[PDB]
PDB file of C-alpha atoms and ligand atoms in Angstrom:
ATOM      1  CA  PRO C   1      93.624 122.767 114.174  1.00 46.12           C
ATOM      2  CA  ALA C   2      97.066 124.392 113.474  1.00 44.55           C
ATOM      3  CA  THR C   3      97.842 125.020 117.174  1.00 44.26           C
ATOM      4  CA  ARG C   4      97.410 121.306 117.966  1.00 45.68           C
ATOM      5  CA  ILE C   5      99.700 120.292 115.198  1.00 48.41           C
ATOM      6  CA  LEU C   6     102.273 122.775 116.643  1.00 50.76           C
ATOM      7  CA  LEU C   7     101.887 120.935 119.980  1.00 50.75           C
ATOM      8  CA  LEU C   8     102.547 117.443 118.195  1.00 50.86           C
ATOM      9  CA  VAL C   9     105.730 118.884 116.651  1.00 51.08           C
ATOM     10  CA  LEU C  10     106.893 120.492 120.016  1.00 51.42           C
ATOM     11  CA  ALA C  11     106.420 116.855 121.511  1.00 52.02           C
ATOM     12  CA  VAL C  12     108.293 115.364 118.632  1.00 52.82           C
ATOM     13  CA  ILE C  13     111.176 117.919 119.183  1.00 50.85           C
ATOM     14  CA  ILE C  14     111.491 117.042 122.853  1.00 53.72           C
ATOM     15  CA  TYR C  15     111.453 113.274 122.115  1.00 49.49           C
ATOM     16  CA  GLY C  16     113.981 113.699 119.210  1.00 50.03           C
ATOM     17  CA  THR C  17     116.271 115.824 121.240  1.00 50.41           C
ATOM     18  CA  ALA C  18     116.235 113.874 124.393  1.00 49.35           C
ATOM     19  CA  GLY C  19     116.722 110.668 122.587  1.00 50.50           C
ATOM     20  CA  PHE C  20     119.745 111.753 120.563  1.00 52.17           C
ATOM     21  CA  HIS C  21     121.348 113.208 123.615  1.00 49.90           C
ATOM     22  CA  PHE C  22     120.955 110.281 125.918  1.00 47.63           C
ATOM     23  CA  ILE C  23     121.272 107.495 123.225  1.00 43.81           C
ATOM     24  CA  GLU C  24     124.167 109.048 121.066  1.00 43.65           C
ATOM     25  CA  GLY C  25     125.869 111.256 123.871  1.00 45.02           C
ATOM     26  CA  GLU C  26     125.659 114.523 121.754  1.00 45.76           C
ATOM     27  CA  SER C  27     125.069 117.887 123.607  1.00 46.93           C
ATOM     28  CA  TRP C  28     121.612 119.277 123.854  1.00 48.65           C
ATOM     29  CA  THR C  29     122.325 121.941 121.215  1.00 49.04           C
ATOM     30  CA  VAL C  30     123.561 119.349 118.701  1.00 48.67           C
ATOM     31  CA  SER C  31     120.667 116.901 119.480  1.00 48.92           C
ATOM     32  CA  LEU C  32     117.992 119.595 119.003  1.00 48.87           C
ATOM     33  CA  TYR C  33     119.718 120.738 115.588  1.00 48.78           C
ATOM     34  CA  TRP C  34     119.829 117.180 114.671  1.00 50.93           C
ATOM     35  CA  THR C  35     116.323 116.658 115.350  1.00 51.27           C
ATOM     36  CA  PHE C  36     115.137 119.610 113.288  1.00 49.93           C
ATOM     37  CA  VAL C  37     117.564 118.570 110.377  1.00 44.92           C
ATOM     38  CA  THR C  38     116.048 114.993 110.556  1.00 45.20           C
ATOM     39  CA  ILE C  39     112.366 115.672 110.758  1.00 45.58           C
ATOM     40  CA  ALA C  40     112.614 118.363 108.061  1.00 48.50           C
ATOM     41  CA  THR C  41     114.147 115.560 106.196  1.00 51.73           C
ATOM     42  CA  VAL C  42     117.234 117.850 105.468  1.00 49.13           C
ATOM     43  CA  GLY C  43     119.725 115.466 107.162  1.00 54.99           C
ATOM     44  CA  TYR C  44     123.151 116.752 106.561  1.00 56.49           C
ATOM     45  CA  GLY C  45     125.026 113.650 107.935  1.00 57.24           C
ATOM     46  CA  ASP C  46     127.263 115.754 110.132  1.00 58.82           C
ATOM     47  CA  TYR C  47     125.461 113.991 112.973  1.00 61.04           C
ATOM     48  CA  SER C  48     123.894 110.531 112.816  1.00 60.58           C
ATOM     49  CA  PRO C  49     123.378 107.598 115.108  1.00 61.83           C
ATOM     50  CA  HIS C  50     126.290 105.221 115.474  1.00 62.88           C
ATOM     51  CA  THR C  51     124.716 102.616 117.698  1.00 62.50           C
ATOM     52  CA  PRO C  52     122.172 100.143 116.885  1.00 63.04           C
ATOM     53  CA  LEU C  53     119.674 101.751 119.378  1.00 63.90           C
ATOM     54  CA  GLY C  54     120.357 105.091 117.885  1.00 66.47           C
ATOM     55  CA  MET C  55     119.461 103.764 114.585  1.00 67.24           C
ATOM     56  CA  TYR C  56     116.206 102.195 115.585  1.00 65.61           C
ATOM     57  CA  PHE C  57     115.393 105.359 117.557  1.00 67.36           C
ATOM     58  CA  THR C  58     116.068 107.509 114.359  1.00 70.53           C
ATOM     59  CA  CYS C  59     113.728 105.224 112.347  1.00 69.75           C
ATOM     60  CA  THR C  60     110.956 105.825 114.962  1.00 70.30           C
ATOM     61  CA  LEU C  61     111.608 109.552 115.041  1.00 69.15           C
ATOM     62  CA  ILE C  62     111.462 109.650 111.152  1.00 70.96           C
ATOM     63  CA  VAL C  63     107.983 107.879 111.164  1.00 70.64           C
ATOM     64  CA  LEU C  64     106.759 110.252 113.999  1.00 68.57           C
ATOM     65  CA  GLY C  65     108.357 113.438 112.894  1.00 67.20           C
ATOM     66  CA  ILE C  66     108.358 113.855 109.088  1.00 74.48           C
ATOM     67  CA  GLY C  67     104.548 113.757 108.653  1.00 72.04           C
ATOM     68  CA  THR C  68     103.935 116.075 111.746  1.00 74.48           C
ATOM     69  CA  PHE C  69     106.591 118.575 110.645  1.00 76.10           C
ATOM     70  CA  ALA C  70     105.558 118.826 106.989  1.00 77.12           C
ATOM     71  CA  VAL C  71     101.923 119.671 107.902  1.00 76.72           C
ATOM     72  CA  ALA C  72     103.139 122.081 110.648  1.00 79.02           C
ATOM     73  CA  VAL C  73     105.110 124.166 108.088  1.00 80.97           C
ATOM     74  CA  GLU C  74     102.328 124.285 105.567  1.00 82.45           C
ATOM     75  CA  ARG C  75      99.756 125.310 108.247  1.00 80.19           C
ATOM     76  CA  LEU C  76     102.083 127.986 109.467  1.00 79.82           C
ATOM     77  CA  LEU C  77     102.387 129.083 105.579  1.00 77.52           C
ATOM     78  CA  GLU C  78      98.581 129.520 105.440  1.00 77.10           C
ATOM     79  CA  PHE C  79      98.499 131.426 108.751  1.00 75.83           C
ATOM     80  CA  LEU C  80     101.122 133.907 107.884  1.00 75.46           C
ATOM     81  CA  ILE C  81     100.382 134.468 104.131  1.00 77.80           C
TER      82      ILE C  81
ATOM     83  CA  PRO V   1      99.417 134.551  93.842  1.00 77.89           C
ATOM     84  CA  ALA V   2     102.629 132.711  92.519  1.00 77.33           C
ATOM     85  CA  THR V   3     104.675 135.849  92.113  1.00 76.06           C
ATOM     86  CA  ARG V   4     104.294 136.804  95.757  1.00 74.09           C
ATOM     87  CA  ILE V   5     105.439 133.353  96.729  1.00 72.02           C
ATOM     88  CA  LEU V   6     108.410 133.941  94.566  1.00 69.17           C
ATOM     89  CA  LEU V   7     109.240 137.064  96.356  1.00 68.83           C
ATOM     90  CA  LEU V   8     109.014 135.351  99.663  1.00 67.24           C
ATOM     91  CA  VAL V   9     111.465 132.710  98.530  1.00 70.05           C
ATOM     92  CA  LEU V  10     113.766 135.466  97.235  1.00 70.45           C
ATOM     93  CA  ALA V  11     113.648 137.036 100.737  1.00 67.96           C
ATOM     94  CA  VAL V  12     114.267 133.655 102.401  1.00 70.46           C
ATOM     95  CA  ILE V  13     117.280 133.082  99.958  1.00 68.08           C
ATOM     96  CA  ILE V  14     118.896 136.557 100.940  1.00 67.19           C
ATOM     97  CA  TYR V  15     118.404 135.661 104.669  1.00 67.55           C
ATOM     98  CA  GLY V  16     119.842 132.234 104.228  1.00 68.98           C
ATOM     99  CA  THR V  17     122.803 133.338 102.193  1.00 69.34           C
ATOM    100  CA  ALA V  18     123.862 136.402 104.269  1.00 68.90           C
ATOM    101  CA  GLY V  19     123.363 134.446 107.506  1.00 71.59           C
ATOM    102  CA  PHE V  20     125.563 131.539 106.629  1.00 73.81           C
ATOM    103  CA  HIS V  21     128.329 133.944 105.140  1.00 76.52           C
ATOM    104  CA  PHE V  22     128.289 135.951 108.331  1.00 73.32           C
ATOM    105  CA  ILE V  23     127.711 133.454 110.892  1.00 72.51           C
ATOM    106  CA  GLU V  24     129.749 130.476 109.427  1.00 73.83           C
ATOM    107  CA  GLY V  25     132.324 132.447 107.304  1.00 73.21           C
ATOM    108  CA  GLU V  26     131.802 130.636 104.013  1.00 74.05           C
ATOM    109  CA  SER V  27     132.070 132.570 100.626  1.00 71.04           C
ATOM    110  CA  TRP V  28     128.915 134.103  99.138  1.00 74.05           C
ATOM    111  CA  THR V  29     128.701 131.484  96.392  1.00 74.54           C
ATOM    112  CA  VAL V  30     129.036 128.593  98.921  1.00 74.04           C
ATOM    113  CA  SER V  31     126.423 130.225 101.211  1.00 71.92           C
ATOM    114  CA  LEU V  32     123.820 130.633  98.411  1.00 72.44           C
ATOM    115  CA  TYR V  33     124.317 127.042  97.302  1.00 69.86           C
ATOM    116  CA  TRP V  34     124.013 125.805 100.729  1.00 69.89           C
ATOM    117  CA  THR V  35     120.793 127.897 101.266  1.00 67.60           C
ATOM    118  CA  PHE V  36     119.266 126.294  98.093  1.00 67.09           C
ATOM    119  CA  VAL V  37     120.386 122.782  99.080  1.00 66.01           C
ATOM    120  CA  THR V  38     119.012 123.319 102.529  1.00 63.22           C
ATOM    121  CA  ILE V  39     115.576 124.843 101.695  1.00 62.70           C
ATOM    122  CA  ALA V  40     114.897 122.359  99.006  1.00 63.01           C
ATOM    123  CA  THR V  41     115.784 119.837 101.633  1.00 65.36           C
ATOM    124  CA  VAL V  42     118.460 118.133  99.715  1.00 65.97           C
ATOM    125  CA  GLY V  43     121.196 118.873 102.255  1.00 63.83           C
ATOM    126  CA  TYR V  44     124.524 117.221 101.144  1.00 62.48           C
ATOM    127  CA  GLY V  45     126.358 117.913 104.305  1.00 62.59           C
ATOM    128  CA  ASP V  46     129.398 119.195 102.371  1.00 60.87           C
ATOM    129  CA  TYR V  47     128.512 122.421 104.228  1.00 62.48           C
ATOM    130  CA  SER V  48     126.854 122.635 107.414  1.00 62.10           C
ATOM    131  CA  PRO V  49     126.870 125.073 110.503  1.00 61.08           C
ATOM    132  CA  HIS V  50     129.660 124.272 112.984  1.00 62.79           C
ATOM    133  CA  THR V  51     128.823 126.950 115.603  1.00 63.14           C
ATOM    134  CA  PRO V  52     125.733 126.952 118.063  1.00 65.44           C
ATOM    135  CA  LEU V  53     124.528 130.118 116.502  1.00 65.67           C
ATOM    136  CA  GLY V  54     124.773 128.704 112.981  1.00 66.97           C
ATOM    137  CA  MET V  55     122.649 125.635 114.194  1.00 65.15           C
ATOM    138  CA  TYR V  56     120.101 127.821 115.659  1.00 62.33           C
ATOM    139  CA  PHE V  57     120.120 130.003 112.446  1.00 58.46           C
ATOM    140  CA  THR V  58     119.772 126.840 110.251  1.00 58.40           C
ATOM    141  CA  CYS V  59     116.797 125.664 112.206  1.00 59.18           C
ATOM    142  CA  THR V  60     114.906 128.886 111.629  1.00 59.20           C
ATOM    143  CA  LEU V  61     115.968 128.881 107.939  1.00 59.99           C
ATOM    144  CA  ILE V  62     114.488 125.417 107.838  1.00 58.17           C
ATOM    145  CA  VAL V  63     111.223 126.665 109.296  1.00 60.87           C
ATOM    146  CA  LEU V  64     110.920 129.633 107.097  1.00 60.60           C
ATOM    147  CA  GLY V  65     112.526 128.199 103.906  1.00 59.72           C
ATOM    148  CA  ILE V  66     111.260 124.679 103.383  1.00 63.71           C
ATOM    149  CA  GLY V  67     107.404 125.425 103.065  1.00 64.75           C
ATOM    150  CA  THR V  68     107.989 128.594 100.986  1.00 63.90           C
ATOM    151  CA  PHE V  69     110.310 126.853  98.696  1.00 62.73           C
ATOM    152  CA  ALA V  70     108.019 123.773  98.167  1.00 63.83           C
ATOM    153  CA  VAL V  71     105.030 125.795  97.254  1.00 60.33           C
ATOM    154  CA  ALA V  72     107.190 128.010  94.937  1.00 60.59           C
ATOM    155  CA  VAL V  73     108.440 125.039  92.863  1.00 59.95           C
ATOM    156  CA  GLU V  74     104.881 123.506  92.666  1.00 60.47           C
ATOM    157  CA  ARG V  75     103.468 126.891  91.495  1.00 60.32           C
ATOM    158  CA  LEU V  76     106.310 127.175  88.892  1.00 62.52           C
ATOM    159  CA  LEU V  77     105.207 123.764  87.748  1.00 58.90           C
ATOM    160  CA  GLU V  78     101.717 124.755  87.226  1.00 58.03           C
ATOM    161  CA  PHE V  79     102.671 127.875  85.306  1.00 58.19           C
ATOM    162  CA  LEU V  80     105.105 126.314  82.848  1.00 60.14           C
ATOM    163  CA  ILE V  81     103.197 123.181  82.288  1.00 60.39           C
TER     164      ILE V  81
ATOM    165  CA  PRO Z   1      98.896 113.689  81.617  1.00 61.61           C
ATOM    166  CA  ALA Z   2     101.240 111.329  83.566  1.00 60.77           C
ATOM    167  CA  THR Z   3     103.271 110.382  80.417  1.00 60.13           C
ATOM    168  CA  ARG Z   4     104.066 113.867  79.734  1.00 59.04           C
ATOM    169  CA  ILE Z   5     105.420 114.326  83.330  1.00 60.46           C
ATOM    170  CA  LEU Z   6     107.597 111.201  82.736  1.00 59.70           C
ATOM    171  CA  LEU Z   7     109.069 112.798  79.686  1.00 58.34           C
ATOM    172  CA  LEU Z   8     109.815 116.006  81.582  1.00 56.99           C
ATOM    173  CA  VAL Z   9     111.491 113.921  84.334  1.00 51.73           C
ATOM    174  CA  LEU Z  10     113.506 111.892  81.519  1.00 53.24           C
ATOM    175  CA  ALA Z  11     114.730 115.460  80.218  1.00 53.40           C
ATOM    176  CA  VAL Z  12     115.550 116.495  83.643  1.00 53.42           C
ATOM    177  CA  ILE Z  13     117.582 113.289  84.318  1.00 54.02           C
ATOM    178  CA  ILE Z  14     119.652 113.670  80.889  1.00 54.41           C
ATOM    179  CA  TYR Z  15     120.301 117.342  81.750  1.00 54.70           C
ATOM    180  CA  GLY Z  16     121.383 116.425  85.544  1.00 58.66           C
ATOM    181  CA  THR Z  17     123.496 113.653  84.289  1.00 60.98           C
ATOM    182  CA  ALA Z  18     125.357 115.283  81.416  1.00 57.28           C
ATOM    183  CA  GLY Z  19     126.079 118.334  83.517  1.00 55.78           C
ATOM    184  CA  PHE Z  20     127.564 116.725  86.468  1.00 54.39           C
ATOM    185  CA  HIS Z  21     129.704 114.590  84.166  1.00 53.12           C
ATOM    186  CA  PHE Z  22     130.952 117.459  82.137  1.00 52.91           C
ATOM    187  CA  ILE Z  23     130.986 120.078  84.891  1.00 53.37           C
ATOM    188  CA  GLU Z  24     132.317 117.976  87.869  1.00 55.52           C
ATOM    189  CA  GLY Z  25     134.093 115.248  85.944  1.00 50.80           C
ATOM    190  CA  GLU Z  26     132.405 112.239  87.516  1.00 53.37           C
ATOM    191  CA  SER Z  27     131.735 109.028  85.515  1.00 54.94           C
ATOM    192  CA  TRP Z  28     128.279 108.699  83.725  1.00 53.61           C
ATOM    193  CA  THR Z  29     127.208 106.070  86.256  1.00 55.17           C
ATOM    194  CA  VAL Z  30     127.896 108.391  89.258  1.00 54.54           C
ATOM    195  CA  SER Z  31     126.378 111.352  87.526  1.00 56.76           C
ATOM    196  CA  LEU Z  32     122.989 109.707  86.879  1.00 57.83           C
ATOM    197  CA  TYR Z  33     123.073 108.341  90.410  1.00 56.55           C
ATOM    198  CA  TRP Z  34     123.679 111.855  91.868  1.00 56.96           C
ATOM    199  CA  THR Z  35     120.917 113.202  89.650  1.00 56.37           C
ATOM    200  CA  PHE Z  36     118.309 110.863  91.051  1.00 54.96           C
ATOM    201  CA  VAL Z  37     119.638 111.290  94.455  1.00 52.19           C
ATOM    202  CA  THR Z  38     119.593 115.140  94.078  1.00 53.08           C
ATOM    203  CA  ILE Z  39     116.127 115.554  92.507  1.00 52.69           C
ATOM    204  CA  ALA Z  40     114.460 113.029  94.785  1.00 56.71           C
ATOM    205  CA  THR Z  41     116.082 115.319  97.315  1.00 57.93           C
ATOM    206  CA  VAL Z  42     117.801 112.275  99.026  1.00 59.59           C
ATOM    207  CA  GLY Z  43     121.229 114.017  98.518  1.00 61.05           C
ATOM    208  CA  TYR Z  44     123.807 111.662 100.567  1.00 61.57           C
ATOM    209  CA  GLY Z  45     126.598 114.075  99.919  1.00 63.81           C
ATOM    210  CA  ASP Z  46     128.947 111.115  98.691  1.00 63.92           C
ATOM    211  CA  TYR Z  47     128.944 113.338  95.521  1.00 61.93           C
ATOM    212  CA  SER Z  48     128.455 116.989  95.298  1.00 64.01           C
ATOM    213  CA  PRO Z  49     129.670 119.870  93.190  1.00 65.92           C
ATOM    214  CA  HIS Z  50     133.110 121.246  93.989  1.00 67.05           C
ATOM    215  CA  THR Z  51     133.366 124.143  91.473  1.00 64.19           C
ATOM    216  CA  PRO Z  52     131.495 127.380  91.449  1.00 64.53           C
ATOM    217  CA  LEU Z  53     129.727 126.269  88.161  1.00 60.00           C
ATOM    218  CA  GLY Z  54     128.685 122.962  89.512  1.00 61.19           C
ATOM    219  CA  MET Z  55     127.128 124.720  92.514  1.00 62.54           C
ATOM    220  CA  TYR Z  56     125.152 127.085  90.282  1.00 64.52           C
ATOM    221  CA  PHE Z  57     124.275 124.112  87.957  1.00 68.89           C
ATOM    222  CA  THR Z  58     123.128 122.119  91.074  1.00 69.20           C
ATOM    223  CA  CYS Z  59     120.719 124.987  92.116  1.00 72.35           C
ATOM    224  CA  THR Z  60     119.111 125.044  88.740  1.00 69.88           C
ATOM    225  CA  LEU Z  61     118.835 121.326  88.587  1.00 70.64           C
ATOM    226  CA  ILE Z  62     117.254 121.555  92.149  1.00 73.72           C
ATOM    227  CA  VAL Z  63     114.650 124.138  90.682  1.00 73.33           C
ATOM    228  CA  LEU Z  64     113.742 121.984  87.577  1.00 76.61           C
ATOM    229  CA  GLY Z  65     114.132 118.537  88.995  1.00 78.73           C
ATOM    230  CA  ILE Z  66     112.488 118.376  92.433  1.00 81.92           C
ATOM    231  CA  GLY Z  67     108.874 119.548  91.442  1.00 81.21           C
ATOM    232  CA  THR Z  68     108.861 117.414  88.369  1.00 82.05           C
ATOM    233  CA  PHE Z  69     110.124 114.242  90.174  1.00 83.37           C
ATOM    234  CA  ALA Z  70     107.580 114.729  93.170  1.00 85.61           C
ATOM    235  CA  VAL Z  71     104.636 114.688  90.755  1.00 83.54           C
ATOM    236  CA  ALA Z  72     106.015 111.852  88.652  1.00 82.14           C
ATOM    237  CA  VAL Z  73     106.438 109.486  91.643  1.00 82.36           C
ATOM    238  CA  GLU Z  74     102.759 110.400  92.916  1.00 80.26           C
ATOM    239  CA  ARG Z  75     101.335 110.076  89.412  1.00 78.65           C
ATOM    240  CA  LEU Z  76     102.998 106.732  89.194  1.00 76.33           C
ATOM    241  CA  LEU Z  77     101.674 105.731  92.508  1.00 76.71           C
ATOM    242  CA  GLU Z  78      98.073 106.487  91.162  1.00 78.84           C
ATOM    243  CA  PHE Z  79      98.654 104.594  88.153  1.00 76.01           C
ATOM    244  CA  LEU Z  80      99.984 101.246  89.675  1.00 75.10           C
ATOM    245  CA  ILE Z  81      97.626 101.259  92.836  1.00 76.78           C
TER     246      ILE Z  81
ATOM    247  CA  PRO T   1      92.833 101.967 102.053  1.00 75.49           C
ATOM    248  CA  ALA T   2      95.719 102.949 104.495  1.00 75.55           C
ATOM    249  CA  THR T   3      96.431  99.258 105.557  1.00 78.29           C
ATOM    250  CA  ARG T   4      97.129  98.293 101.899  1.00 76.47           C
ATOM    251  CA  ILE T   5      99.677 101.279 101.599  1.00 78.70           C
ATOM    252  CA  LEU T   6     101.345 100.068 104.875  1.00 79.21           C
ATOM    253  CA  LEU T   7     101.758  96.668 103.173  1.00 77.96           C
ATOM    254  CA  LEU T   8     103.343  98.317 100.217  1.00 77.64           C
ATOM    255  CA  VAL T   9     105.760 100.177 102.492  1.00 73.24           C
ATOM    256  CA  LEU T  10     106.548  96.831 104.292  1.00 70.00           C
ATOM    257  CA  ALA T  11     107.418  95.209 101.046  1.00 67.46           C
ATOM    258  CA  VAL T  12     109.449  98.133 100.051  1.00 67.56           C
ATOM    259  CA  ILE T  13     111.455  98.062 103.240  1.00 68.27           C
ATOM    260  CA  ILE T  14     112.155  94.235 102.897  1.00 69.88           C
ATOM    261  CA  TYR T  15     113.293  94.994  99.390  1.00 69.02           C
ATOM    262  CA  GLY T  16     115.511  97.829 100.368  1.00 67.38           C
ATOM    263  CA  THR T  17     117.037  96.216 103.400  1.00 66.05           C
ATOM    264  CA  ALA T  18     117.897  92.813 101.563  1.00 68.04           C
ATOM    265  CA  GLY T  19     119.308  94.655  98.576  1.00 70.07           C
ATOM    266  CA  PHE T  20     121.665  97.000 100.486  1.00 68.88           C
ATOM    267  CA  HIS T  21     122.797  93.947 102.699  1.00 69.23           C
ATOM    268  CA  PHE T  22     123.553  91.669  99.709  1.00 69.27           C
ATOM    269  CA  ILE T  23     124.699  94.212  97.218  1.00 68.76           C
ATOM    270  CA  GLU T  24     126.806  96.559  99.451  1.00 66.97           C
ATOM    271  CA  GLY T  25     127.518  94.047 102.356  1.00 64.77           C
ATOM    272  CA  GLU T  26     126.280  96.150 105.308  1.00 62.11           C
ATOM    273  CA  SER T  27     124.792  94.414 108.359  1.00 59.97           C
ATOM    274  CA  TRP T  28     121.027  93.798 108.481  1.00 58.41           C
ATOM    275  CA  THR T  29     120.503  96.489 111.032  1.00 61.66           C
ATOM    276  CA  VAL T  30     122.600  99.176 108.938  1.00 57.19           C
ATOM    277  CA  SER T  31     120.702  98.195 105.730  1.00 60.70           C
ATOM    278  CA  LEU T  32     117.250  98.760 107.371  1.00 60.05           C
ATOM    279  CA  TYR T  33     118.275 102.000 108.839  1.00 62.01           C
ATOM    280  CA  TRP T  34     119.551 103.122 105.507  1.00 64.66           C
ATOM    281  CA  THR T  35     116.408 101.767 103.854  1.00 65.53           C
ATOM    282  CA  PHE T  36     114.286 104.064 106.108  1.00 67.18           C
ATOM    283  CA  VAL T  37     116.710 107.003 105.986  1.00 66.20           C
ATOM    284  CA  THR T  38     116.646 106.706 102.059  1.00 64.88           C
ATOM    285  CA  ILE T  39     112.819 106.340 101.504  1.00 63.74           C
ATOM    286  CA  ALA T  40     111.887 109.087 103.976  1.00 65.12           C
ATOM    287  CA  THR T  41     114.514 111.021 101.750  1.00 64.22           C
ATOM    288  CA  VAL T  42     116.470 111.824 104.919  1.00 60.49           C
ATOM    289  CA  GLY T  43     119.752 110.364 103.521  1.00 57.60           C
ATOM    290  CA  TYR T  44     122.449 111.180 105.929  1.00 58.27           C
ATOM    291  CA  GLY T  45     125.285 109.760 103.660  1.00 59.72           C
ATOM    292  CA  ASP T  46     126.750 107.850 106.529  1.00 58.90           C
ATOM    293  CA  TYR T  47     125.893 104.783 104.445  1.00 60.99           C
ATOM    294  CA  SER T  48     125.429 104.912 100.592  1.00 60.75           C
ATOM    295  CA  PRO T  49     126.045 102.556  97.741  1.00 57.33           C
ATOM    296  CA  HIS T  50     129.675 102.148  96.482  1.00 59.24           C
ATOM    297  CA  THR T  51     129.316  99.759  93.615  1.00 61.97           C
ATOM    298  CA  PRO T  52     127.634 100.466  90.202  1.00 63.28           C
ATOM    299  CA  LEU T  53     124.924  97.814  91.039  1.00 64.51           C
ATOM    300  CA  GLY T  54     124.247  99.442  94.518  1.00 61.97           C
ATOM    301  CA  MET T  55     123.809 102.783  92.890  1.00 63.90           C
ATOM    302  CA  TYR T  56     121.290 101.388  90.167  1.00 63.54           C
ATOM    303  CA  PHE T  57     119.554  99.613  93.001  1.00 65.27           C
ATOM    304  CA  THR T  58     119.420 102.912  95.171  1.00 64.77           C
ATOM    305  CA  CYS T  59     117.722 104.708  92.199  1.00 64.29           C
ATOM    306  CA  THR T  60     114.956 101.918  91.795  1.00 63.18           C
ATOM    307  CA  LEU T  61     114.511 102.065  95.638  1.00 61.05           C
ATOM    308  CA  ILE T  62     114.102 105.682  95.354  1.00 59.09           C
ATOM    309  CA  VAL T  63     111.444 105.365  92.692  1.00 59.93           C
ATOM    310  CA  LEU T  64     109.503 102.495  94.451  1.00 62.54           C
ATOM    311  CA  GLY T  65     109.947 103.828  98.074  1.00 67.99           C
ATOM    312  CA  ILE T  66     109.560 107.669  98.368  1.00 72.49           C
ATOM    313  CA  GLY T  67     106.061 107.971  97.081  1.00 74.73           C
ATOM    314  CA  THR T  68     104.769 104.848  99.115  1.00 68.89           C
ATOM    315  CA  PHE T  69     106.486 106.180 102.343  1.00 70.01           C
ATOM    316  CA  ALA T  70     105.119 109.850 101.918  1.00 65.43           C
ATOM    317  CA  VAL T  71     101.553 108.627 101.537  1.00 64.23           C
ATOM    318  CA  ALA T  72     102.058 106.021 104.367  1.00 64.39           C
ATOM    319  CA  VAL T  73     103.091 108.707 106.837  1.00 67.56           C
ATOM    320  CA  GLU T  74     100.238 111.052 105.936  1.00 65.02           C
ATOM    321  CA  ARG T  75      97.626 108.308 106.059  1.00 68.68           C
ATOM    322  CA  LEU T  76      98.959 107.512 109.559  1.00 72.80           C
ATOM    323  CA  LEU T  77      98.739 111.188 110.336  1.00 73.35           C
ATOM    324  CA  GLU T  78      95.063 111.112 109.481  1.00 73.34           C
ATOM    325  CA  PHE T  79      94.362 107.858 111.524  1.00 70.38           C
ATOM    326  CA  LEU T  80      95.890 108.884 114.728  1.00 70.62           C
ATOM    327  CA  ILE T  81      94.937 112.592 114.672  1.00 71.62           C
TER     328      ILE T  81
HETATM  329 BA1   BA S   1     117.717 115.089 102.401  1.00 70.52          BA
HETATM  330 BA1   BA S   2     114.459 115.633 101.593  1.00 70.37          BA
HETATM  331 BA1   BA S   3     120.612 114.615 102.844  1.00 70.80          BA
END
């Protein structure tokens, strides 16, 4: 069900944002922006992890986030069109 | 229908381009180039939002753009091959 | 047929590489590397178009390249596994 | 079978990491981080190949990695949801 996928993406977003903020020390706004940019796999590289923990964290975010986000946008696609 | 998807991508492009131009202050050419680069999820990071509004705007563009663009290229694929 | 898709990707690669070389003035090696990095939508941003023509060219490359490349890797996936 | 795909992604990861380390001279941590960031097609451009060999290597990594990684995350998606 699409709504459940949405909930998974929301959980991923919180995880991404909190982690970047507390591991890398960026603001909450930058961290959320980075989370979206990373999980949509856009990844501008204006922000990126600079510590070894941040890098490991980024890899797990990638593993949890990218699949979940892809299915969310295409389920949203189906629903609105 | 493929043509309707195309229209959605065109609307997304206009939205992306106008927004980056007026929120971030880049030229129209740069803004359109950034829109394509962002919604195809290529995202070089030569251009990126630098304000909190631009960042929020970028996230919504990502949500509206990436799904629409993916389906457009693959429907175009089917049509030409 | 997978082989025909491969031929399309090869044509896209030549187009991408020649264009970046002659429009942006990078070496042939850099241009090919940029073409792959762009059409796989990896896009590091170590190389990017700096002229208005290069930017327009990049958008058309994106439109022609990304769909073709995606289907090529997944058809290659099927064939080898 | 999903587990076999996982094994392919693990092999790709080792290949990516060892190659970047020995070709480009980055640490093992940076090389692994770059491998994930590249094969998920996130590609921040904080790290990128700077030699002609590294660039050729990156293209082959892209060809081997991106398809394998995409199918792995979506098979993982199915398994956990
Ligand atoms: Ba990217
Ligand atoms: Ba991408
Ligand atoms: Ba990128």
